[PDB]
Amino acid sequence: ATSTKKLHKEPATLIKAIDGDTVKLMYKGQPMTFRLLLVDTPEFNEKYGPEASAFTKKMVENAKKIEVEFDKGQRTDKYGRGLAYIYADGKMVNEALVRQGLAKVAYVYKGNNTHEQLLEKAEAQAKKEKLNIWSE
Numbered sequence: 001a002t003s004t005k006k007l008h009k010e011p012a013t014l015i016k017a018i019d020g021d022t023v024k025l026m027y028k029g030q031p032m033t034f035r036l037l038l039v040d041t042p043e044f045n046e047k048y049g050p051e052a053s054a055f056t057k058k059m060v061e062n063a064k065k066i067e068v069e070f071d072k073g074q075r076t077d078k079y080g081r082g083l084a085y086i087y088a089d090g091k092m093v094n095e096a097l098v099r100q101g102l103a104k105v106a107y108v109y110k111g112n113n114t115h116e117q118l119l120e121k122a123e124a125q126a127k128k129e130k131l132n133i134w135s136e
C-alpha cells in the first residue's frame, strides 16, 4: 500500500481582499486571485454581500500570517483563479464565513472535498443560530 501527500499549508501575502470568497495573494512571488473552496458568499450587491466582503477583508487584513492550502484535486477554476482553503493566523476563512452564516456550502466537487464535513457542521450551526443568510 502507498499513500499520497496530506494537505499542507503554504505561506502567501495579502495583496487585496476582493469580496466575501475571493482574495488576491502574492503566492511564490506572483499575484494569484484565489477563490475559496466549498463556499459561496452573496455578491456585493445582494443581501449580506457587503457583510461577507467586510468579514473576509477584516480577517485577511488583520492576519500576520496567511496560508494557502490546496485540496487534492483541481487547483484552478476555468477563470484562472486558484482554488484553496485560506487561513488567517490558523483560522480557516472558508469555515469562518460558513459558521457566521455569510456563506453557503457550495461548489462541492468530490475531487476537492477534504473539508466538506467540517464546513457542513459549521453551516448547520449557523442555520440553528439563524445567522445572516439563514435568519429567515
Ligand SMILES: Cc1cn([C@H]2C[C@H](OP(=O)(O)O)[C@@H](COP(=O)(O)O)O2)c(=O)[nH]c1=O
Pocket (backbone or CB within 6 Å): 021, 022, 035, 036, 037, 038, 039, 040, 041, 077, 078, 083, 106, 107, 109
Ligand atoms: C468554488 C469554486 C468555484 N468555481 C467557479 C464556478 C463558477 O463559475 P461558473 O458559474 O461560470 O461555473 C464561479 C463562481 O464564482 P463566484 O462565486 O466568485 O462568482 O466559480 C469553480 O469552478 N470551482 C470551485 O470549486
Ligand SMILES: [Ca+2]
Pocket (backbone or CB within 6 Å): 021, 040, 041, 042, 043
Ligand atoms: Ca460568490
